[PDB]
Amino acid sequence: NFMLTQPHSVSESPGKTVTISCTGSSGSIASNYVQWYQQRPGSSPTTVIYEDNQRPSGVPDRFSGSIDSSSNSASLTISGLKTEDEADYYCQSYDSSNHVVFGGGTKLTVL
Numbered sequence: 001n002f003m004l005t006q007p008h009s010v011s012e013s014p015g016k017t018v019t020i021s022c023t024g025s026s027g028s029i030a031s032n033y034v035q036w037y038q039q040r041p042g043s044s045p046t047t048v049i050y051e052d053n054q055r056p057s058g059v060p061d062r063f064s065g066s067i068d069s070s071s072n073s074a075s076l077t078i079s080g081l082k083t084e085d086e087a088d089y090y091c092q093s094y095d096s097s098n099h100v101v102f103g104g105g106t107k108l109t110v111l
Contacts, residue, residue: 002026002095004103011109012085018078022091022103029093030069036076037090039105045090049076086110 005023012018022034036048049055052065052074064077074091091103 002093002101004091004093004101006089006091006103006106008104009107009109011111012081013111014082016081018076018081018085018108020076020078020089020091020106021073022075022093023073024093026095028069028072029074030067032094032096034065034067034074035092036063036065037092039088039090041087043087048089081110083110 003025005025006021020036022029034052035050036052037045038048039045047056048059048063049065052067055061055063062078062080064079066075066077068075078085085108087108089106089108091105093101093103095101
């Protein structure tokens with residue numbers, strides 16, 4: 001079996017940071033690359049980070065993905081949060097068979 005576990009819903013006030021933790025149910029989340037996605041209302045999904053190692057040049061650098069082999073979970077650190085964040089987040093991972101995987105997702109609500 002291979003799946004990810006994240007928060008059902010979370011909120012954060014402006015000025016503060018946003019933390020997205022995605023737990024892997026199977027093996028170390030560091031044995032595979034992890035990607036991040038965001039789903040804005042009425043809009044389509046967009047990749048925020050890639051291979052948890054960096055992000056495409058030109059995309060804002062207010063996001064940061066991190067992988068914890070020890071804790072067997074992933075944790076992204078975001079800076080300068082704003083309503084432009086109010087949206088649904090998505091996590092993805094790869095299995096040994098090099099197969100893309102998806103997580104439950106997370107609803108970020110900004111007030």
